[PDB]
Amino acid sequence: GVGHQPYRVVVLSFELLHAPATVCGPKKSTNLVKNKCVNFNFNGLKGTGV
């Protein structure tokens, strides 16, 4: 039957933490701007500041 058919199962587990990251998305980094109120995105951490 359909319910008795075998299936291939892949489980992905992520370590989402405040730790250094080695697996990242395909986003491309830009230059660094200091002493100016800008938006920032550091490894998926988004914010707005200086």
Added chain:
Amino acid sequence: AYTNSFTRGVYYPDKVFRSSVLHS
């Protein structure tokens, strides 16, 4: 035999920098 710990074995609970704070 046995001996005393003398307030030893305290480790960092996480990998987040915290300065001048009393954290429970």
